[PDB]
Design a protein around this ligand. Structure first.
Ligand SMILES: O=C(O)CCC(=O)C(=O)O
Ligand SMILES: [Mn+2]
Length: 203
DNA sequence: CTGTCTCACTGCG
DNA sequence: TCGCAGTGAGACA
């Protein structure tokens, strides 16, 4: 291991942040991701929330071992077979953390108008206690942690941090039980961002 | 006086 | 421009 982590801690919050790649390498990986990743469209890009169906305000893709599935918000996604650039990132993350992953959800935000609404990654197909590894390329975007009982008896402070080009954010147990997260709209950001959340899914 | 939950939106302020 | 409130159409437990 031996890595410079920034620990994000609060009640029920255990997250870690480090920069894995310098600019030249991260640029190279980003350009490969832009060339190689295939995103879902049409019916595989619509979610149901609060009884309404929506096209997702971004693009999504999934890769991982054969036989696995991932379902959230009325949407079931099937993994495409691994490709070199994603295996490079998975293996690097695995070496630095000691954790293994069999699945990745890729989110692409074309600019600051693309975003993701607040949620917990608490799905049943997720291995109990398993961490989620979030790797980011392209534009730096703000990421928000919010405590679930602040929306509002327990006015617990929100946690904000920018996720930089080439960075890794580890979300350990029980972060996803007690805290919601989101990438809010940032109208000033004009460049695209590609995010990878490596997960461990049960068969 | 009092059920829990929501990866999304519009309508505010 | 950003953040918050209330969803809304049910499915739960
Ligand atoms: O865009 C991000 O950095 C986070 C994406 C996310 O929340 C997820 O993959 O579940
Ligand atoms: Mn998430």
């Amino acid at each position: 291991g031996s890595h410079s982590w920034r620990h994000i801690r609060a009640e029920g919050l255990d997250s870690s942040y480090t920069v894995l790649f310098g600019k030249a390498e991260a640029d190279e990986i980003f350009q490969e991701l832009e060339k190689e990743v295939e995103y879902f469209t049409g019916a595989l890009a619509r979610v149901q929330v609060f009884g309404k169906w929506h096209s997702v305000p971004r693009k999504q893709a999934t890769y991982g071992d054969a036989g696995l599935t991932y379902t959230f918000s009325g949407l079931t996604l099937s993994p495409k077979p691994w490709i070199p650039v994603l295996e490079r990132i998975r293996d690097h993350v695995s070496g630095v953390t000691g954790q293994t992953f069999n699945f990745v959800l890729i989110n692409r935000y074309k600019d600051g108008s693309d975003h993701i609404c607040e949620h917990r990654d608490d799905e049943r197909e997720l291995a109990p206690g398993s961490p989620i590894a979030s790797v980011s390329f392209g534009a730096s975007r703000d990421f928000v942690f919010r405590h679930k009982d602040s929306r509002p008896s327990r006015r617990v402070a929100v946690v904000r941090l920018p996720l930089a080009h080439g960075s890794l954010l580890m979300m350990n147990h029980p972060t996803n039980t007690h805290w919601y997260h989101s990438l809010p709209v940032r109208k000033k950001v004009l460049a695209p961002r590609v995010n990878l959340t490596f997960r461990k899914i049960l068969l």
